């Protein structure tokens, strides 16, 4: 298990909490992004994720550095899955430990916003009658 | 120079990489220019370019040996 | 597992995430509170929590309701441990799922705030020189 | 009426609970007066009172068969 990783296997979640804990930390926040079935109108069959892997892994490492700078005392771990994901599968997991609770919440929310901004990962939404790569 | 395509561009172009011989170093802008002439069918698609896994300005140079990736709007998470 | 529970036994964590998941949920945020050895120079040997169990369980459910009120679509689960707790042991876990990520983070952070405010639970800091019950 | 004690008060009073017989109902205020005349050593300690697992005001009534709980400043999490 790397601190920052792109994987093809289902994400084993609890080991990421463990990585971030030590005696100085009193808080851990874990965020998991799951595939939703319904509603921008027509039901999602599944999601296909792909990545430019080495650079994607680097950009995740970079977000960890930004978090260390902005919130010292934190430890961050991030993993993203690729390939076809089913309804409710974990696409992404972010774990941030910290001495006190607020930094953990802040750094964790920072991470997910930065992933959506700078990491070369792309999702394709497939449904019965078609499919389309997403932007933003 | 190794060129890498992803997402919608990968699908339009039917391929994930190709090799393109550059006589000399080109600015990112010139390379996009070359790409649109070579591939009319993607000149309405938005992408940044990454050289050796780094984002770059349009007036930065691509060396003949560099690896260049077309990065469409990202939709991770 | 109860959705809102006081436990003596070490908290087993993955199940609380799983309780909150369904096809509508895009994000789960889980907060764990861990016993800290060092607090800005000060050394903790161990902690000792006690509680007014039936009231504390009522009050935790009341927070679930408040969250459902303020962030419709959320599912929430909360467990708090009592007794003597060692360094890095999980004293509290808070799991919130929501269709969207912002609600998940907001709701989780509200929950921990409210627990510190209303729920009848008390921690006793033990150090090598003595001990003391904490207030706010 | 079952009185319950927790945290520092449990420690001071050297007891976890007790039963006080009440002939008639009385206010939370009158209950505190009763408690402090019995236990002067806790007359300077902060707490809220809970009657049957809900917090109450000083003008609220305690019945003889009620359960009452002295809740010192909470410190959960
Ligand atoms: N089907 C589907 N599932 C998804 C996302 C999505 O866009 N479509 N966004 C992913 C995210 O990155 C997070 O953003 P979000 O959409 O704000 O909600 C939580 C997460 O849901 C995730 N799961
Ligand atoms: N030794 C020691 N460890 C602690 C706490 C504490 O009060 N003493 N608070 C617990 C909390 O409720 C949270 O408080 P906090 O100040 O939000 O920091 C994170 C958590 O740390 C926990 N770990």
Q: Do A33 and C87 touch (CB under 8 A)?
A: no
DSSP D2-58: EEE--HHHHHHHT-SEEE---SS-EEHHHHHHHHHHH-GGGTT---EEEETTEE--T
Looking at CA atoms only, how far is residue A54 from chain C in angstroms?
26
Q: Which ligand is nearest to the CA of C85?
A: 2
C99 touches chain A (CB under 8 A): yes
| Residues of chain B contacting residue A55, judged by C-beta atoms under 8 Å apart | 50, 53-54, 69
Q: What are the contacts of C130-135 at 24+ separation with CB within 8 A?
A: C133/D7, C133/D8, C133/D11, C133/D72, C133/D75, C134/D75, C135/D46, C135/D72, C135/D73, C135/D75
CB atoms within 10 A of CB C30: 25
Protein residue with least CA distance to atom 11, ligand 1: B77
Q: Which ligand is nearest to the CA of A134?
A: 1
Q: Which ligand is nearest to the CA of C46?
A: 2
Determine phi and psi for A113, rounding to 5 degrees.
-70, -35
* Residue B42 belongs to domain spanning: 1-77
Q: Ligand 2 mean position to C34 CA, how many Å? A: 7
Number of domains in chain B: 1
Sheet containing A46-51, strands listed edge to edge, beginning at the edge strand earlier in sequence? A83-85, A46-51, A121-127, A130-133
Q: Which candidate, A75, A64, A47, A73, places its Cα nearest to that of A110?
A: A64
DSSP A35-79: ---S-SSS---EEEEEE-HHHHHHHHHHHHHHHHHHSTT-EEEEE
Protein residue with least CA distance to atom 15, ligand 2: A100
Nearest to B77 among A50, A92, A135 (CB): A92
Q: How far is Cα A76 from Cα A107, in angstroms, rounded to an integer?
A: 8
C100 touches chain A (CB under 8 A): no
> Helices C101-118 & A101-118, crossing angle to 10 degrees?
180
Resolution in Å, one decimal place: 2.5
Measure CA A11 to chain center. 11
> Helices C101-118 & C53-70, crossing angle to 10 degrees?
150
Q: How many CB pairs under 8 A join A and B?
A: 65
D18 close to D3: Cβ distance less than 8 angstroms: yes
Looking at CA atoms only, how far is residue C100 from chain A in angstroms?
9
Q: Which two tokens stand for residue C59?
A: 């009050």
D32 close to D48: Cβ distance less than 8 angstroms: no
| Residues of chain A contacting residue B71, judged by C-beta atoms under 8 Å apart | 52, 120
Determined by X-ray
Protein residue with least CA distance to atom 5, ligand 1: A35
For residues A49-67, one letter each, b for 16 or more C-beta atoms within 10 angstroms of the residue's C-beta and e for the rest, the string is bbbbeebbbbbbeebbeeb
Q: Do A55 and B50 touch (CB under 8 A)?
A: yes
Protein residue with least CA distance to atom 18, ligand 1: C100
Residue D38 belongs to domain with CATH number: 3.10.20.30
B16 touches chain A (CB under 8 A): no
Q: Which candidate, C77, C75, C79, C92, places its Cα nearest to that of C26?
A: C75
Q: Which domains are present in chain C?
A: 1-136 (3.90.1170.40)
A126 touches chain B (CB under 8 A): no
CA distances from C108 to A19, B39, B61 (A): 22, 49, 47
Contacts of B64 (CB under 8 A, 6+ apart): B1, B21, B22, B23, B24, B25
């Amino acid at each position: 298990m790397k601190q920052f990783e792109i994987v093809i296997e289902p994400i084993q979640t609890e080991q990421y909490r463990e990585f971030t804990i030590n005696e100085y930390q009193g808080a851990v926040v874990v965020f998991t992004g799951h595939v939703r079935e319904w509603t921008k109108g027509v039901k999602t069959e599944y999601l296909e994720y792909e990545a430019y892997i080495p650079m994607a892994e680097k950009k995740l490492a970079q977000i960890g550095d930004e978090i260390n700078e902005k919130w010292p005392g934190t430890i961050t771990s991030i993993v993203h899955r690729i390939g076809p994901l089913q309804i409710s599968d974990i696409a992404v997991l972010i774990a941030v430990s910290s001495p006190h609770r607020k930094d953990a919440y802040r750094a964790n929310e920072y991470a997910i916003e930065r992933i959506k901004e700078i990491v070369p990962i792309w999702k394709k939404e497939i449904w019965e009658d078609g499919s389309k790569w997403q932007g933003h | 120079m190794k060129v890498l395509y992803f997402a919608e561009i990968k699908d339009i172009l039917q391929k994930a990489q190709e090799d393109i011989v550059l006589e000399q170093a080109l600015t990112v802008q010139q390379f996009e220019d070359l790409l649109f002439e070579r591939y009319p069918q993607i000149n309405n698609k938005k992408f940044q370019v990454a050289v050796n896994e780094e984002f770059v300005q349009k007036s930065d140079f691509i060396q003949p040996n560099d690896t260049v990736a077309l990065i469409p709007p990202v939709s991770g998470g």
